[PDB]
Amino acid sequence: AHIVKIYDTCIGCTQCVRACPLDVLEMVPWDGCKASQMASAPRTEDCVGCKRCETACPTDFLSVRVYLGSESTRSMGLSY
Amino acid sequence: PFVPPSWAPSVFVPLTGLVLPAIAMATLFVYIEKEAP
Amino acid sequence: EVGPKRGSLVKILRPESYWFNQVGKVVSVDQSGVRYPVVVRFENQNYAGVTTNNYALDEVVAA
Amino acid sequence: IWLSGMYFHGARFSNYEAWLSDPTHIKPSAQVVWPIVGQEILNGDVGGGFQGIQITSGFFQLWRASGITSELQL
Amino acid sequence: ATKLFPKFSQGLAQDPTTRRIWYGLAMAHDFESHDGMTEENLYQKIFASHFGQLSIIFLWTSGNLFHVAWQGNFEQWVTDPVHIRPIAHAIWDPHFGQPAVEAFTRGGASGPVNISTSGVYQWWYTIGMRTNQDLYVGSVFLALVSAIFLFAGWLHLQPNFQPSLSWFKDAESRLNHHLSGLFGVSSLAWTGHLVHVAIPESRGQHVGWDNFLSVLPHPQGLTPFFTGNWAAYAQSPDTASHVFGTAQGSGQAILTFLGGFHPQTQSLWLTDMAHHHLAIAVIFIVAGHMYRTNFGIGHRMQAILEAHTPPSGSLGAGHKGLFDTVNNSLHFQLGLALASVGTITSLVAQHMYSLPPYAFQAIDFTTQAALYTHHQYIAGFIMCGAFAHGAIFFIRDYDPEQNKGNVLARMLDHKEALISHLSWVSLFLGFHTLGLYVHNDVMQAFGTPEKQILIEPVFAQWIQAAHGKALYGFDFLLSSKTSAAFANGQSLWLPGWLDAINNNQNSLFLTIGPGDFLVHHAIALGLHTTTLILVKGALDARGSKLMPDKKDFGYSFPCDGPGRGGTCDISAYDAFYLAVFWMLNTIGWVTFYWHWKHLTLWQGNVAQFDESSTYLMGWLRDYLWLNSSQLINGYNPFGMNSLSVWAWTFLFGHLIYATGFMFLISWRGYWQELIETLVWAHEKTPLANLVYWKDKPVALSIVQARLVGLAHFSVGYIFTYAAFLIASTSGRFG
Amino acid sequence: DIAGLTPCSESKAYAKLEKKELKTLEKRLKQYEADSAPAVALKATMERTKARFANYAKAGLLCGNDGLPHLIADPGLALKYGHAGEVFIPTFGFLYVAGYIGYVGRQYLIAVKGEAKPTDKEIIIDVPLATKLAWQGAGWPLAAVQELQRGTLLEKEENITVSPR
Ligand code: CLA
Ligand code: CLA
Ligand code: CLA
Ligand code: CLA
Ligand code: CLA
Ligand code: CLA
Ligand SMILES: CC1=C(/C=C/C(C)=C/C=C/C(C)=C/C=C/C=C(C)/C=C/C=C(C)/C=C/C2=C(C)CCCC2(C)C)C(C)(C)CCC1
Ligand SMILES: CC1=C(C/C=C(\C)CCC[C@H](C)CCC[C@H](C)CCCC(C)C)C(=O)c2ccccc2C1=O
Ligand code: SF4
Ligand code: SF4
């Protein structure tokens, strides 16, 4: 399983969620920014680490990171 | 007092070319695939 | 109240920012309880092609 | 434009007629370099009282196959 | 599944792929990142591993002694070594055919032996071996010693004898013993062996383990040593009419200072080497009492580091707090060790081609070639390792707050200046070197060879005139007969050195000209470039502007994906990865250059070098093309000869090399899809869907394939050049 | 002489190479006529060749054992023995023109940063301004040492340095 962490510079623009091809990110209520939202990663056992969430983040140096870790049969994307 | 015999390459070469690789690879292959209880 | 006024030029001190030690222009300063209220534009773009970023109060200097 | 260049260089800067007079022993040449820093050694002795770079593109055999006998037609 | 292999990393022994096998082979010696690794356990494992390495070294040397003593002809080689070739070992290959064995049987043997291009024969003849029996005794002894070291390595893991952590990290007590004991006493004892055995064997005698207790090494003996008459050990040394293995012109001296070479054997005198090891034994033993142990007078290294911060603050804190990072980290110490050992290795090569120590060296030319090339390539790899462990130090063991203001933080503060100026010198040397070579090529191609730039290397010729080479007409400091240095050294240690430096037949201070100018600049280009890549990788390991948290990923991580324009090869591992190619190139240049200059020296025409060395066609035609005539004729449809094995290795290298390109050029995912279709095919094939994988097959990971491609590149490169060098030099002169 | 060689005037290898080149050239010349443009070009080559040898002999060049000229790169040595025209004068000439190019470029860059769209005037050259600055810097070194001594040549530490340390 990989390590996906959301940081506090998030502005809650939902770009990371629409870019995730595996549905491991979701938007939770929050009271720290104008949009009153913040991303969260409740299902990092389904993540494969494609790093589209990092590409979609607008704020400079990113508000979401994907640290690579120990692979499994789901995090390798093996269909056989 | 030490001398290896005249027939020594003939025996020791295929031993270390064929036998020890065979035992090594078979033993290691059983070791690799073992399941932890 | 809380921040420098719009149109003014500021200087970034947040290190991980791509525009560290450079000059930007302020757009708006949020008055609410946001953690990062200062919206700064820049005339060049970072690697990702974005030219706008939020910053904290102490990380910008009127210069 | 390219074909026109080839026919022009065949017409003006070659030894096509000297080649038609004797195809063996006279090698096809259709390019002449200018006498500057020393590149003039590239002008080879191609036969026929001519000097230049031997061509392998084989326009001369094509022209003889079409019937061209003079540089004016080129 | 949750397989056993490997036990050091639980997360690795978890996945059902074939990644676990390769990674389990790859992370075995990464002790710092196993499961449950404390610090004491780390040091103890490193200690036992050192014992393992020592065991392997001594066992290997015993192997060399045994094979030379059994299958070689060392007993016959010592009678005439400008003749019958050395013998390494004998072959028993059932794949041979009749002319093969008929061909390989050479050197006076009775079967397929192959020549020993290693220089062990000259070493063992100089130090004082003469028969087989002594070699066997040495082999048995070294095998026994290897067994002792292996047992000790097992011993110090047993839980009663495990040293605690603070026994390690004891700097001051380790250096006194290393410097005094390990260097000084070993050097003193080696002087003992030279004086007692090696000299009287070179006078003609058999001083063995029998009757070395009853033989005077000098016919006065420990009277002048205890009187203070030491110059009575140097009177009447060996005459220049000497014959080495006999008593003809034999002297009596044991500690001289002559310089020069032996007039009949083209090596250094043994008495000088006795005196040298004696002198530096005294120096090292005296230098071993600097630091503090459980006594009074010693030094503290922390005080010494603390007090050296300069006033005016040109350095911030100077060396404050370094002692708690040199002591606390292993990659820092390993980096320093690899740096020193690599530079010393180069020095070994550079001195052993020019000042040959061993008897009848430099008349076996293949020995010279293989020795120098070997040590050069070894030095290259060692230096690359030094910078790699620098990068690992920065990522894993560096702490900023402990290093606030010392020189180590200053180096991280202004690193862009370093990288910029290394880039500048690399560019400058590249443009001008390549330009001058291309200009000389163009001039040579047209009919005018006098229109080309041939700069005379006047600096190095100034230096060679400073050392005594009286050919350039400069007349100063050792070449002038009225200098202070010349007159002071004249009476005892100059006249050998001058006769050895004005000879144009030895390798000592070869005559140089414009080709040497150009090639030395090429070498400087190699060094500055490789330093650029390595230093950039080391200093940008904490983070860059493309990525300011590179420290959170560790040393060797693949990439950061397509974002921000895509970041391939961003890790420090990949910087070192790029540097390896430059190391191979640069050593290629120095070794091509050395080899060709000495080929033209040994053949006879230095003119061919001094003319054809100034334009690259000279290299391609007169070195690579002309000298590979007897190599590739190692076998043909007409027959084969001795150098057929080399002519097969020579293609083998290319094959490995070209396979090396595959893992570099074609990156991963293509192979992933191909392997997936293969999985489908083996899954649906009838009568072969009865045999399955236990661990699912996947393609090689991004980091691994770089290492594999580099392995093929390096191995093929080395095998090809070794084949060409041995085959060419031993085909001509051998 | 200068590191064990001789000047090309009495160098035996020099005249041998000269004779060899003339020999091959006349060998090429033999098979043509006396009015043909081949022979015209060949005789032109003879003239240029012999003139080149005379020019290299006249300038006091130094030849090794191959009969080829050798350049001396040392200020004291070349200035003492009359060889300032092979490295020394060329290096000062090149440094002049190279600093000239660099200075002109830099002045253009500062001249165009002060506009409303610096990128357009970088991709589309302001030709009047470029020719103007192309003239205005023929004496660059004086302006360079003035910019150095006033402290405007160097930006201060408002340059962007990598984060972090
Ligand atoms: C470590 C150094 C070393 C090396 C590289 C070699 C190399 C060789 N030996 Mg050898 N040998 C050595 C030491 C060495 N020897 C010693 C110390 C002895 C005395 C016991 C011998 C006695 C010996 C005989 C009697 C014969 C050879 C022969 C050979 C050749 C065929 C290979 C073979 O069958 O070896 C067999 C080698 C041995 C049985 C001795 C090895 C003993 C140690 C304990 C093993 C070391 C284990 C090793 C480090 C672990 C690597 C494996 C690991 C990767 C899984 C080959 C050239 C044959 C030959 O000459 O053919 C022409 C042959 O008949 N060797
Ligand atoms: C397309 C094929 C082709 C090729 C490869 C060549 C190649 C050559 N020709 Mg040639 N030629 C061609 C077609 C070609 N020609 C045609 C079609 C004709 C008939 C009009 C000629 C007539 C011709 C003559 C009469 C001569 C050559 C010569 C030459 C040689 C020297 C050219 C030279 O020095 O240029 C000189 C360099 C320039 C003119 C530089 C111009 C570059 C400008 C400034 C670029 C500006 C950019 C601009 C936006 C784009 C150009 C637009 C255009 C309308 C100008 C060279 C081998 C000479 C030769 O063989 O001597 C022995 C010669 O005397 N050619
Ligand atoms: C006098 C006592 C003494 C002696 C002899 C040694 C000796 C050694 N210690 Mg040691 N040690 C000592 C006291 C001593 N120590 C004390 C008191 C402590 C506690 C502070 C330690 C703590 C300690 C640790 C923690 C470790 C050692 C290690 C070692 C070994 C180093 C590896 C090696 O072989 O280097 C050999 C080096 C040389 C022979 C010198 C090389 C000199 C130059 C570079 C070579 C060139 C010379 C010449 C040209 C070569 C000729 C070539 C020839 C083939 C022709 C070595 C056996 C290490 C080891 O291997 O553990 C097993 C290790 O990890 N020791
Ligand atoms: C003093 C010697 C020394 C020591 C003790 C170490 C120790 C270490 N190094 Mg290191 N290193 C050294 C020299 C040394 N290195 C040199 C000289 C280089 C330059 C090449 C490097 C380059 C280097 C890199 C780049 C890295 C290390 C790493 C490491 C650490 C883990 C090693 C590991 O897991 O490898 C396991 C070892 C293997 C899997 C063996 C692989 C086999 C190689 C590819 C050779 C194969 C060639 C083949 C045998 C040819 C056969 C020919 C055929 C025809 C028969 C460890 C602390 C790694 C680390 O710290 O990770 C963060 C790391 O990234 N080192
Ligand atoms: C790149 C470095 C370098 C090197 C290795 C040399 C090498 C040499 N120069 Mg030299 N030189 C250089 C750069 C260099 N030059 C530059 C840049 C200048 C311009 C300032 C000079 C100006 C110069 C003069 C004016 C003279 C030399 C001379 C010499 C020769 C002997 C003096 C010497 O080595 O001093 C060591 C040089 C250095 C450590 C490099 C720094 C450069 C200094 C300034 C030159 C030192 C000159 C020296 C003091 C004169 C000694 C007189 C001699 C009779 C004893 C020697 C071949 C002398 C000569 O003609 O010899 C026959 C001489 O008269 N040089
Ligand atoms: C004209 C502006 C200009 C100026 C003032 C400089 C100045 C400098 N460059 Mg640089 N450079 C430039 C353009 C310029 N460069 C361009 C266009 C490129 C390629 C895209 C480079 C590529 C480059 C590299 C790769 C490196 C430098 C380096 C350097 C520094 C050392 C000098 C050097 O090595 O030059 C060498 C110059 C080159 C290799 C290329 C020069 C290209 C042409 C000749 C210049 C451009 C002329 C310009 C188009 C004219 C436009 C003006 C006109 C519109 C009026 C120096 C500060 C080096 C450095 O960092 O040193 C610390 C270094 O590593 N530069
Ligand atoms: C990265 C890194 C690292 C590493 C580094 C390195 C690797 C380095 C190297 C370095 C080197 C490798 C250096 C070298 C040096 C050398 C020198 C410095 C030399 C000197 C010499 C001399 C001084 C000489 C002199 C003389 C002469 C001239 C002759 C005569 C004699 C005499 C002696 C006088 C470390 C680990 C630290 C850590 C951090 C990071
Ligand atoms: C061929 C290839 C593969 C496919 C490679 C595979 C599937 C492995 C092939 C190895 C076979 C299975 C065995 C090779 C035989 C060796 C002798 C094995 C040595 C094992 C050591 C332990 C000795 C990749 O996965 C890849 C990934 C990234 C870049 C380039 C490439 C690439 O070029
Ligand atoms: S790496 Fe891919 S799967 Fe994982 S969170 Fe990001 S977008 Fe989703
Ligand atoms: S893309 Fe970035 S800023 Fe936008 S919601 Fe996701 S993490 Fe937050």
Curated annotation (Swiss-Prot), chain C:
Keyword line: Chloroplast, Membrane, Photosynthesis, Photosystem I, Plastid, Thylakoid, Transit peptide
Its membrane topology: Peripheral membrane protein
Protein known as: Photosystem I reaction center subunit IV, chloroplastic
Function: Stabilizes the interaction between PsaC and the PSI core, assists the docking of the ferredoxin to PSI and interacts with ferredoxin-NADP oxidoreductase.
Oligomeric form and interacting partners: Interacts with ALB3.1, which is essential for its insertion into thylakoid membrane.
Subcellular location: Plastid, Chloroplast thylakoid membrane
Gene Ontology, cellular component aspect: chloroplast thylakoid membrane; photosystem I reaction center
Full-protein residues shown: 34 to 96 of 97
Family, as annotated: Belongs to the PsaE family.
GO BP, one annotated term: photosynthesis
The organism of origin for this protein: Chlamydomonas reinhardtii
Main location: plastid
From Swiss-Prot, chain D:
Protein name in the entry: Photosystem I P700 chlorophyll a apoprotein A1
Part of the full-length chain shown: 86 to 159 of 751
Subcellular localization(s) per the UniProt record: Plastid, Chloroplast thylakoid membrane
Lineage of the organism: Eukaryota, Viridiplantae, Chlorophyta, core chlorophytes, Chlorophyceae
Family stated for the protein in its record: Belongs to the PsaA/PsaB family.
Protein function: PsaA and PsaB bind P700, the primary electron donor of photosystem I (PSI), as well as the electron acceptors A0, A1 and FX. PSI is a plastocyanin/cytochrome c6-ferredoxin oxidoreductase, converting photonic excitation into a charge separation, which transfers an electron from the donor P700 chlorophyll pair to the spectroscopically characterized acceptors A0, A1, FX, FA and FB in turn. Oxidized P700 is reduced on the lumenal side of the thylakoid membrane by plastocyanin or cytochrome c6.
Complexes and interactors: The PsaA/B heterodimer binds the P700 chlorophyll special pair and subsequent electron acceptors. PSI consists of a core antenna complex that captures photons, and an electron transfer chain that converts photonic excitation into a charge separation. The eukaryotic PSI reaction center is composed of at least 11 subunits.
Curated annotation (Swiss-Prot), chain E:
Keywords: 4Fe-4S, Chlorophyll, Chloroplast, Chromophore, Electron transport, Iron, Iron-sulfur, Magnesium, Membrane, Metal-binding, Oxidoreductase, Photosynthesis, Photosystem I, Plastid, Thylakoid, Transmembrane, Transmembrane helix, Transport
Main location: plastid
Catalytic activity: reduced [plastocyanin] + hnu + oxidized [2Fe-2S]-[ferredoxin] = oxidized [plastocyanin] + reduced [2Fe-2S]-[ferredoxin]
UniProt cross-references to Pfam families, sorted A to Z: PsaA_PsaB
Enzyme class: oxidoreductase
Binding site for phylloquinone: 671
Binding sites annotated in the UniProt record for [4Fe-4S] cluster: 559, 568
Superkingdom as given in the UniProt entry: Eukaryota
GO terms for biological process, alphabetical: photosynthesis
Annotated binding of chlorophyll a B3, by residue: 662, 670
Effect of residue 654 to C/G/N/S: Contains somewhat decreased amounts of PSI, depending on the strain; significantly changes the spin density of the P700+ cation radical
GO cellular component: chloroplast thylakoid membrane; photosystem I
Chain positions recorded as chlorophyll a B1 binding sites: 654
Gene3D superfamilies membership: Photosystem I PsaA/PsaB (1.20.1130.10)
EC number annotated for this UniProt entry: 1.97.1.12
Matches recorded under InterPro entries: PSI_PsaA/B (IPR001280), PSI_PsaA/B_CS (IPR020586), PSI_PsaA/B_sf (IPR036408), PSI_PsaB (IPR006244)
Sample GO molecular function, one term: chlorophyll binding
Compartments where located: Plastid, Chloroplast thylakoid membrane
Membrane topology: Multi-pass membrane protein
Assembly notes: The PsaA/B heterodimer binds the P700 chlorophyll special pair and subsequent electron acceptors. PSI consists of a core antenna complex that captures photons, and an electron transfer chain that converts photonic excitation into a charge separation. The eukaryotic PSI reaction center is composed of at least 11 subunits.
Family: Belongs to the PsaA/PsaB family.
Full protein name: Photosystem I P700 chlorophyll a apoprotein A2
Curated annotation (Swiss-Prot), chain F:
Lineage top rank: taxon: Eukaryota
Role description: Probably participates in efficiency of electron transfer from plastocyanin to P700 (or cytochrome c553 in algae and cyanobacteria). This plastocyanin-docking protein contributes to the specific association of plastocyanin to PSI.
Principal place of residence: plastid
GO biological process, one term: photosynthesis
Residues included from the entire protein: 63 to 227 of 227
Family from the record: Belongs to the PsaF family.
Keywords: Chloroplast, Photosynthesis, Photosystem I, Plastid, Thylakoid, Transit peptide
GO cellular component: chloroplast thylakoid lumen; photosystem I reaction center
Protein name per UniProt: Photosystem I reaction center subunit III, chloroplastic
Organism: Chlamydomonas reinhardtii (Chlamydomonas smithii)
Compartments reported by the entry: Plastid, Chloroplast thylakoid lumen
Gene: PSAF
